[PDB]
Design a protein around this ligand. Structure first.
Ligand code: SF4
Ligand code: SF4
Ligand code: SF4
Ligand code: SF4
Ligand code: SF4
Ligand code: SF4
Ligand code: SF4
Ligand code: SF4
Ligand code: SF4
Ligand code: SF4
Ligand code: SF4
Ligand code: SF4
Ligand code: FES
Ligand code: FES
Ligand code: FES
Lengths: 554, 554, 554
């Protein structure tokens, strides 16, 4: 399709939604602040201005036609773009040094490139809202009111706890009545953070606490989540490698970690316990369908939204809490040191794990939760060339896991691990998987001795409401709050989009492929733990089982 | 240092051996056919001609002086270089399509670049020698008489079984009296092949036998050596990856391999058996010092050169033969299929393993041995993107190994594995390692209950003669024929030089770092094999022990 | 679209012609020898075999269907592919060292990758045809009978002087009765060479003559064509640069060229003379339409095919011959040296220029014509880093040209230059350009004082026949034998396809953009030449005008 841009012949696609996208797909970029994430919409920034027929208009809302002559760069357009950018910056909290988005901020880059060196306009005061009550931290002084977070929270996560409020100069994205986020129905999934193009939404940093713990004389123990190892190479701009976790082990020992364990061992433990709980439930037809309890965002969502299903939740705690309780109540004893001597650090891809660790039912097990980004900050701070670090394995006795346990890092992993345990105990004849829609997988399972069942994997909160409204023929339901599962967790490296998450899933799959242990029962250390310290039902319930309670405001 | 090249000011190093090297280090390349490998010398090709003071001379033998004016490209020099290249090509066997060096041949590249399209001179007949009696294959019709192989065999391998013979136009690199290589004292290390810049020395290809076996109805079993996985990425010009072996497993299953096992499991088995043999020898002070028998080139060298030490050789067979005997005499029975139904393929970095498999003491265990280059040819033939292949583990019950077993792939690995087994059974207090010279490491070992001993690791035949002439205070000696061990084996990808071998050793070390099994006794499958099928001493001797005999001509 | 390849889920395009192309577009490569150039067709090689439904078939002729399960690599397919490649090689003239396609040959690469080291079959004798009568050189011993050249010559060039002859084992691509190519109606465009995937069709190399001339005491003068500078960077795998021609000047002076002139100066001269010839013809309505005579392939084609239009041909000689005659008959005199002392080298993108230089009407003006590939061979032979060469301008007085003269290197350049000269003398009001089809541009020209005319640019012989059969309303017709003009000449670097030719045209356009002289009359040196040595009509006719004669066989 023939169009003229700045008096030059350009061929674009025959069918395109608007001029801006067509030029972008043909390699011509128009400055703009609307396209910021996968949840973006056009029309707000007004910087995409072009001149067609001697009149200036936004190219994001212009349908191309054959023979159109467009000037993308005129003195008038230059002045208008500079004015709009200056308008944004004048009332922007310009403190990039302490900003979470520093270095990966489109606004900072435009300020650099547009040669903005003095604020011509006035930094007129706005009634800014600062919120630090939750692991998700809000600071509206940096918000550019793009609305990406509102759409993510409403349409993708199905929560909608943040909305545009007020109007005009006092327009602000905020919770109802500016309530602290920790007191709302926010599930702390961090997806809004994953999509925010500024530092307005960020993750609470806890590096200072880790440094303090490392400097003292208490025993610091780290444990790395499955999905951390499949994504942390992005922070360093290097290709994946299945040896990433062992490089992390070496780095952590270098900076003074006493032990580093693999949370995928905890995933093996959780899948082994949950398979038995589910089998008992199926045998006595009680408390069905069973919901997995490994995603704390889903758990909080259920406590807010489905108080009737709280008993249907799996009573087994998540891998982080399970492994942490083992470390604190069994390993500490086996080591001869008081539990008060152990400082347990959990490296996770998830903001909701920070909330989970601080839950009343788990108080004092996990001392701090650091996300993949915080771990990357530790590495970058050291300036060590992580890619040249010699790998070494995780520490015994919680440093080995089956590929099924490592599979927890992506949606469907825990269900696959449960099926693996069931098959290894009570064989499975066949499994018929079906995909009703984009993020829903329904599998029919027939055991050797009958008693078939259906299980579903749902990734992305918000799909849950409709699925639960239309499917009563499923016995076990796995729910992951984040699309693609934990590889797309809120604490993962930014940018955190669909293509990057798919690549992370591929990395995790390749990492699982080099593992020789196929099922949790082939984990000799897990079997030894069960045989030595989790023999009776009472001890197992105390160590690996937790409770849930309804959540309401008044 | 100021010099003028083609009327241009060039600064070179103050201290340099000759003009050619100085220009090369400053980025100026002079065409030449002398620098071909790490065993090269200057003066033979005569193509490095330059004009200094109006007279033409070789730059490889010209000491630079301040203010020298050199013309590197004159019509006269052009004619002389073209004439010399045409002289080489006229009597060269020009059949690149079936040449082993096709695509990585400097002569082929020069023929392409010099625009040689017709042989002006005459392809005058030479009494060419073709030799295909050994896995190392000779074809003097391609030899450019560079002499690199003669130097490698004499000075680096200490064998010197190939030499310049005759003179003038009939000059030829050959064995004494043109004897077949298989009937000489050649140890078949393949180092000459690793250094040859043409196809004159090549490795016998056995792909057609593998295709025939795969096409039949017999069960094809593959087993991959430790050092194959640390080097095969070079053939594809991609970065290392610790997951390489599992990608190989996936590829081999794709092209119809029934099982793929890890020869490093055989390394664990061999180290476990050899540690006990050595401990018995130390206890009764008999048959010392003990020589490792894992390198077949060293074994053949000893049979030729040290008939008095043949009893001092370890009686345990090499990992290839040990694992192959297990597969043929135990696994075949456990599978319910006759041993005649199994076709056992061994993928090795070594040409001497082809000879070893065909030895009389091993006849009919290993059906074919393919080198890393042949495996790369299989992959390239398929055109499959190996880097995108999903990894999967080795097959049970011989698909797992300790890091010590995988360490066999580089010099010192078998000694380290033996020390690991001894430590796990009879603890080791300390080990004092010393390096008398470049490829010799001497370690003092003290066990818990006294009975200390010294062991040496020697890599590179030729160092052995002098070490054995000057050290009577060592109890165990590990000998690897190839410098750096098997990462620098004759069957490894070309070019095969010191820097590449060091990088391969680094890759293998990183691969060993991600392994959770530290010692052979932690290998549950190895323990189960010993407990089920290698219980009595008679069965163990029959399965894992071999004999040696003197080698002499008459 | 969901398909399974080697038991793996692959998504391909919904609408695709065959499985092979679909897999290729999805990143899966199947070995094959059918896809070799832009003139290729499927079905001949038979190496693209896949297994679908347990039966083997060619993937190039398999329409994909949803759910198809295909095995691209089975032992049976492996054997068949190896057998087919061995069948090709057995009867192939395997002399890569002296082959023109050495290093860029798909067959050589497959021989390397398939591990073919011995010809199992027999090199059964074929009645091979060797032809060296023309600058296009034929050697059927290397032909793989792909048929690409037959299609190029018939359908793209509209000549069809080469065809498949005989059948079975004696099938051969040849001229009628194996007549020498120089005695046929071949126009020597070299497009068949540009498309041939082997060395069966090559360009006659003339480097040895240049070396001989440079070594003697005669004055060697070089002149570089416009399109040589826009394409020679491909041989060195480096990005374009508008300074390429001046680097060539520096390199040529380094290897002993006395002078280097710019043939684009000759293009300015030719356009200036041809504009006046055309204006006279228009004024007296004689010998119309005028055909440009700058493309010698077109000239030979007309002499064979349109003896009635020979008077309609422009009588002005081509830029090479015009500039060469100036150098030999004017510059030699101005230099004080006999014309016999000058050796004139022409660097061209064209094989037909080699023929033109040897024409009877031009005998002894241009001593040798070397193509871009031969010039690249000179550079590579020197091993000089051409990208680091300091540029220097062309030599006076023929080293400067207008952008219009440099534009000759791509189709439409000479017409644009003629229009530029006419406009600078007799202004042009407007020009209305129209594109009846892919390689035809028709422009309406109105001068200031009326007398409008139409001119057409046709690139790619074969379009000419139909255009001349349907357009009698054009006064001037520019014909270029090669698609895109001289940037796609037969002597250009290989591969020589549409995308590469378009990129070369872009490079030439960028080179023209940095030129400050807009029209030939702004060339002060050209004006001085006309004023000093081309004053009278007789001298101008003798120096810049040539004749044509009919071509027929009997
Ligand atoms: S969002 Fe942060 S990094 Fe970007 S401009 Fe504002 S303060 Fe700077
Ligand atoms: S963390 Fe999740 S639920 Fe909470 S505001 Fe952000 S997107 Fe909404
Ligand atoms: S918080 Fe971030 S994503 Fe939400 S509107 Fe503000 S800038 Fe946009
Ligand atoms: S899906 Fe994973 S990353 Fe996302 S909230 Fe749940 S546990 Fe955290
Ligand atoms: S050594 Fe082999 S590849 Fe090199 S020129 Fe000779 S035949 Fe060709
Ligand atoms: S294989 Fe080794 S011993 Fe034999 S000729 Fe070559 S370098 Fe010498
Ligand atoms: S065999 Fe190879 S290395 Fe030895 S002299 Fe001949 S070309 Fe050189
Ligand atoms: S060192 Fe390794 S590669 Fe070299 S000969 Fe010995 S076993 Fe073979
Ligand atoms: S076409 Fe030339 S380069 Fe290709 S295989 Fe034949 S001889 Fe070798
Ligand atoms: S040079 Fe042109 S006309 Fe001659 S055979 Fe080749 S394609 Fe045909
Ligand atoms: S001459 Fe070249 S293009 Fe023509 S059929 Fe033979 S190989 Fe193919
Ligand atoms: S178009 Fe140019 S390259 Fe092609 S034949 Fe004509 S003059 Fe030669
Ligand atoms: S891109 Fe933001 S308004 Fe057009
Ligand atoms: S480099 Fe070979 S003789 Fe100088
Ligand atoms: S690609 Fe050649 S026959 Fe299919």
């Amino acid at each position: 399709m023939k169009i003229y841009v700045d008096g030059r012949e350009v061929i674009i696609n025959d069918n395109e939604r608007n001029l801006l996208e067509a030029l972008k797909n043909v390699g011509i970029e128009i400055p703009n602040l609307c396209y910021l994430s996968e949840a973006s919409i056009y029309g707000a920034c007004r910087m995409c201005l072009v001149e067609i027929n001697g009149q200036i208009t936004t190219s994001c809302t212009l349908k191309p036609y054959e023979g159109m002559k467009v000037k993308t760069n005129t003195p008038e357009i230059y002045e208008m773009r500079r004015n709009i950018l200056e308008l944004i910056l004048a009332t922007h909290n310009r403190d990039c040094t302490t900003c979470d988005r520093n270095g990966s901020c489109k606004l900072q880059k435009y300020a650099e490139d547009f040669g903005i060196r003095k604020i011509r306009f006035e930094a007129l005061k706005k009634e800014h809202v600062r919120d630090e009550s939750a692991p998700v931290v809000r600071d509206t002084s940096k918000c550019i009111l793009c609305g990406d977070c509102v759409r993510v929270c409403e349409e993708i996560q199905g929560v909608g706890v943040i909305e545009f409020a007020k109007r005009g100069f006092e327009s602000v994205v905020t919770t109802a009545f500016d309530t602290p986020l920790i007191e709302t129905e926010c599930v702390l999934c961090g997806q809004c953070v994953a999509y925010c193009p500024t530092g307005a939404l960020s993750i609470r940093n806890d590096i200072d606490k880790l440094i303090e713990a490392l400097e003292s004389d208490k025993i610091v123990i780290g444990m790395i989540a499955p999905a951390v190892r499949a994504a942390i190479q992005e922070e360093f701009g290097i290709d994946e490698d299945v040896a990433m976790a062992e490089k992390l082990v070496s780095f952590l020992k270098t900076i003074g970690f006493d032990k580093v364990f693999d949370v995928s061992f905890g995933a093996d433990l959780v899948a082994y316990e949950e398979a038995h709980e589910f089998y008992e439930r199926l045998k006595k037809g009680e408390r069905l369908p069973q919901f997995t309890s490994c995603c704390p965002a889903w758990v909080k969502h259920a406590e807010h939204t489905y108080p009737q299903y709280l008993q249907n939740l799996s009573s087994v705690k998540s891998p982080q809490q399970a492994l942490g309780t083992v470390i604190k109540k069994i390993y500490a004893r086996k080591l001869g040191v008081p539990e008060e001597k152990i400082f347990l650090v959990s490296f996770m891809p998830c903001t909701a794990k920070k909330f989970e660790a601080e839950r009343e039912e788990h108080e004092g097990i996990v001392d701090i939760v650091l996300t993949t980004r915080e771990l990357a900050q530790l590495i970058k701070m050291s300036r060590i060339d992580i890619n040249r670090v010699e790998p070494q394995p995780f520490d015994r006795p919680y440093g080995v896991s089956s590929q099924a346990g490592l599979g927890f890092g992506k949606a469907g992993g825990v269900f696959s691990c449960v099926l693996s345990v069931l098959n290894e105990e009570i064989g499975i004849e066949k499994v018929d998987v079906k995909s009703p829609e984009d993020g829903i997988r329904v599998a029919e399972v027939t055991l050797k001795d009958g008693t078939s069942f259906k299980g579903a994997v749902i990734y992305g909160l918000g799909k849950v409401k409709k699925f639960l409204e239309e499917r009563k023929d499923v016995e076990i339901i796995e729910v992951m709050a984040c699309n693609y599962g934990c590889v797309g967790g809120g604490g993962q490296p930014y940018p955190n989009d669909s293509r990057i998450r798919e690549h992370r899933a591929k990395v995790l799959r390749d990492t699982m492929g080099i593992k020789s242990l196929l099922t949790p029962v082939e984990n000799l250390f897990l079997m030894k733990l069960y045989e030595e310290d989790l023999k009776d039902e009472h001890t197992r319930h105390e160590i690996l089982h937790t409770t849930y309670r309804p959540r309401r405001r008044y």
